[PDB]
């Protein structure tokens, strides 16, 4: 049962490192960790420059560092097509993780 905690998650600075802690994942599955936002209804765009892949361990956990930015160039789809700029002080952004099947979780973050 996926659950995630992002610390810290509010009053963040541009270029700040946060820790993403997840539990209840499937051991051995690769999860994509990243900062994302809804760019268009039904379309999520994320920062491909700061995203990373981590395999969940035998306990179904992942603990990863992620650098977040108050504005980023979002990529959409599986081929990573550039969409454009996302400003997280105007739209809601999140940090979280998900597998290729969409299993995962995310937490909304805010910048100072
Ligand atoms: Ca459009």
From Swiss-Prot:
One of its GO terms (molecular function) is DNA binding. It comes from the Bacteria. Disulfide bonds join 36-46, 88-93. Keywords: Antibiotic, Antimicrobial, Disulfide bond, DNA-binding, Signal. Coiled coil: none annotated. One of its GO terms (biological process) is defense response to bacterium. Belongs to the neocarzinostatin family. Binds non-covalently to a chromophore which is the cytotoxic and mutagenic component of the antibiotic. The chromophore binds to DNA as a weak intercalator and causes single- and double-strand breaks. This is Macromomycin. It comes from Streptomyces macromomyceticus. The lineage of its organism: Bacteria, Bacillati, Actinomycetota, Actinomycetes, Kitasatosporales. The chain holds residues 33 to 144 of 144 of the full protein.
């Amino acid at each position: 049962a996926p659950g995630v905690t992002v610390t810290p998650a509010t009053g963040l600075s541009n270029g700040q490192t946060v820790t993403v802690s997840a539990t209840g994942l499937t051991p051995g599955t690769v999860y994509h960790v990243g900062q994302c936002a809804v760019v268009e209804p039904g379309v999520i765009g994320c920062d491909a420059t700061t995203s990373t892949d981590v395999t969940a361990d035998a306990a179904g956990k992942i603990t990863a560092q992620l650098k977040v930015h108050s504005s980023f160039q979002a990529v959409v789809g599986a081929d990573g097509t550039p969409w454009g700029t996302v400003n997280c002080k105007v739209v809601s952004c999140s940090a979280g993780l998900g597998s290729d099947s969409g299993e995962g979780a995310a937490q909304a973050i805010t910048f100072a």
